[PDB]
Amino acid sequence: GSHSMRYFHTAMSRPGRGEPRFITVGYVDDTLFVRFDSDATSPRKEPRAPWIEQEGPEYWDRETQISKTNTQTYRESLRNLRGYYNQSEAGSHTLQRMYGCDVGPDGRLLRGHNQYAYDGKDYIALNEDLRSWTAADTAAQITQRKWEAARVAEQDRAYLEGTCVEWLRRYLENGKDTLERADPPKTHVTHHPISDHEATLRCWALGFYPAEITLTWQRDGEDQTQDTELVETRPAGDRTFQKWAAVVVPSGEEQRYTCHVQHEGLPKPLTLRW
């Protein structure tokens, strides 16, 4: 199927409690494979998936240096942002970035990403053309001006179309037994009386990978969008995910309800009933 590689950067200021913390994690699809934390005893990029362990010392040295440099760059960015918003030195602020590439089954680029947020709000993003920026406000326009003057987008484009895609392809090959394996959900329906006159039907999906899934309830073949309770898809801790969807049904009417499950690992979409 299709795949993605994404890096996530976070820097968090903490006035009076040292310099801003900087972290990075990297993912292929829903698999975290590398991490860095400036607060670690000896900050280094560290492997978090077995298939990345085979990368040599040169890889780990380069990756660590990138993150050490980023720690300093992000501290400068945080200082600049505080000024752009006329903010006091006393408050704590957060800067986030996500960047990377999506590829299809043939490994060809579908699109690239390079986005930032300040205090959880979108700040600036590289457009899909990989040549221009969208700035959220007059502060981000300052960043945009600096980055246009420095032709940053051109560097992003070169990375996203080249290095990003090529290393994702390499990782998919090295990790093929897991990264290219979709695990279907194990499914069942449970029944929970609420009172004498109604009960909850809960449709469960367990043990699936990747996280993307569609669970729905129908009554008499009609989607029950408004009346369905969904929980957020949640990690099991063994790489897989879980989700459930529930409806409240009148006693005796259970056979009118069907649960529908779609997932990449299923040979066929499932219909289930109590």
């Binding site: 890096y7 760059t73 400068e76 560097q155 990375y159």
Partner: peptide
């Protein structure tokens, strides 16, 4: 692999 400074 990460992308190889430009502060905001």
């Amino acid at each position: 692999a990460e992308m190889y400074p430009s502060p905001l």
